[PDB]
Design a protein around this ligand. Structure first.
Ligand SMILES: *C/C=C1/C(=C/c2[nH]c(/C=C3[NH+]=C(/C=C4\NC(=O)C(C=C)=C4C)C(C)=C\3CCC(=O)O)c(CCC(=O)O)c2C)NC(=O)[C@H]1C
Ligand SMILES: *C/C=C1/C(=C/c2[nH]c(/C=C3[NH+]=C(/C=C4\NC(=O)C(C=C)=C4C)C(C)=C\3CCC(=O)O)c(CCC(=O)O)c2C)NC(=O)[C@H]1C
Lengths: 315, 313
């Protein structure tokens, strides 16, 4: 039965069980994963409102100094570019990316998107023809099976992940692994099917708009935003669109129990519906840098197109 | 059918027989790169472009005996695996060579039956592609998508004019969006006859998704031999971006005052929906890595055109 979200934990909401699963507000956890930092800022003035508690250590500045400046002063070269790329009223799915040379922290990748009157800024550390070669190989795959196999093998070669699967949703939202590339010694998930509740209906809705989520370390504690609520609204900060967003503790338990230290998946979206996932596992924690993740994002789109094409060749 | 090419004493092309010029088999290439053909098994260099000596820095005869194994040691096994016998002519493999004579070359290979076609071009060596991808996806409708696409391509390439050129059901063409330098004629809204891109050119553009005329006044460079030794027949060059352009079309480009031209096919439901069409007033060799960006954009636009057309119908 579909039911509306509970309030999050920090607003006195209940703790989540196998029973009320589908009502966790996974988009507003009030916290981020510790391998990057996040700031929120007023979309018109550029006043800095919220920051992750670890921000001082990524950005090399005291909180009170950060919060006491506008983005115009903090990001003089990027602030006008942000404002042109992310105009008021734009969708929350639109992202702008730049690379910064920050004194204390080396090269940072900056990813920005806009939710209403809020700008959300994510900072992460950042670092030949493999993509072009893959694009052509995908297109020349003769059928859906060969496409799925080429796609899994390519992603594994690009990333070094221990396991890369192509998980396909059935009409009842039960899923099935239809191809996989895996490290020697791992047991096969190929052909196994998993119940629909493994990915509850509110996650699948989110996965249709924001096409990549990840869990870099399934044992890492989440880092709170400070303050936790958006001071504009005294309400929760929407983090659906932020890759740094904390993963559900239900899903992190489900991962640790499998022996997985790192998770990542890309949505494959066909005709406006979530067709399936490029899901990846690593046994140890593992951070895939932003520019490599971009390659996977591009492959997500290519695969969406090629899945349509291969399936049309099939009636 | 097709007329024989000129160099096999076929008729010269006119506006009476546009549909029959065998543009895939011109027997020549554009001079900003070099092309070798080679045997699929032996790696034996069978044809070369008369300009190969320039790019490769090799005494002419040296090449036309040697083997790819010898000539490209690191690459030759990769090719063997990447382009297995029986693969499609559409499948391409690329690498960057740090080659003694020329700082860096791009190498592009595909296979047509028993022949490997190798293309060499100068090359080199950020977020504009990722930023463009998200911009295309958040365009609210087909019109805005067209506008974003043309603007994005112009910004990435510096081309004087970028158009989105949409085919009607009878293959009449219509410019539905345009991004252009100040002080050019506007082609926005204009419609053109089907014959401007004849049926044989459209079919070849459904399979091979990018072509260009880097300089509308440059002479083609012959293949030597012109005929493939294997077959004593013309080498198919349709999958080669170095292919000499139709003189008919070079005449069209010159009459419009274009000096450099490039287009990318937008393919939806197995059919040619339209083209990203680029003009420059002067000669312009777009480097391979930037062309790759446009090739990606072509696929992304193909996806988004279907998405957007579905939310009208
Ligand atoms: C009470 C709720 C439970 C639940 C919730 C849940 N699951 C996700 C996300 C995912 N679950 C996945 C399931 C699988 N991963 C596999 O490898 C296999 C099979 C071999 C299955 C069936 C997957 C792939 C995801 C996607 C995320 C990822 O790739 O890591 C969420 C949403 C988490 C988030 O985005 O924060 C939630 C709430 N899962 C259960 O099993 C029950 C107990
Ligand atoms: C006897 C036939 C003639 C003919 C042949 C022909 N045309 C092409 C290719 C193209 N024609 C194009 C037409 C236009 N480009 C524009 O910018 C506009 C409008 C402002 C039009 C109408 C285009 C875009 C192409 C594709 C190539 C490109 O991007 O430049 C070919 C094939 C060329 C080749 O691949 O070698 C041929 C044989 N053109 C005529 O006008 C008639 C008289």
């Amino acid at each position: 039965d579909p039911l509306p979200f509970f309030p999050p934990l920090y607003l006195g909401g209940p703790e989540i069980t196998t029973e009320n699963c589908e009502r966790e507000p996974i988009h507003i956890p009030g916290s981020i994963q510790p391998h990057g930092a996040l700031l929120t800022a007023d979309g018109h003035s550029g006043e800095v409102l919220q920051m992750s508690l670890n921000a001082a250590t990524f950005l090399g500045q005291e909180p009170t100094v950060l919060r006491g400046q506008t983005l115009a002063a903090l990001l003089p070269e990027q602030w006008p570019a942000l404002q042109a790329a992310l105009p008021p009223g734009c969708p929350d799915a639109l992202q702008y990316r730049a690379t910064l040379d920050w004194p204390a922290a080396g090269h940072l990748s900056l990813t920005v998107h806009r939710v209403g009157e809020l700008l959300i800024l994510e900072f992460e550390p950042t670092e030949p023809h493999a993509l072009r070669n893959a694009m052509f190989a995908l297109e020349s795959a003769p059928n859906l099976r060969a496409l799925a196999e080429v796609a899994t093998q390519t992603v594994r070669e690009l990333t070094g992940f221990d396991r890369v699967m192509l998980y396909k949703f059935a009409p009842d939202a039960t899923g099935e692994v239809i191809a996989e590339a895996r490290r020697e010694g791992l047991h096969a998930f190929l052909g196994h099917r998993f119940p629909a509740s493994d990915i509850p209906a509110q996650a699948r809705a989110l996965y249709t708009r924001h096409l990549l989520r990840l869990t870099a370390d399934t044992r890492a504690a989440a880092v709170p935003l400070d303050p936790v609520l958006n001071p504009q609204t005294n309400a929760p900060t929407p983090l659906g669109g932020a890759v740094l967003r904390a993963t559900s503790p239900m899903h992190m338990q489900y991962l640790r129990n499998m022996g997985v230290g790192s998770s990542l998946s890309v949505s494959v979206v066909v005709g406006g519906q979530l067709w399936g996932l490029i899901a990846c596992h690593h046994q140890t924690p593992y951070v895939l840098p932003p520019d490599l993740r971009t390659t996977l994002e591009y492959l997500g789109r290519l695969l969406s197109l090629q899945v349509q094409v291969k399936e049309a060749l099939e009636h």
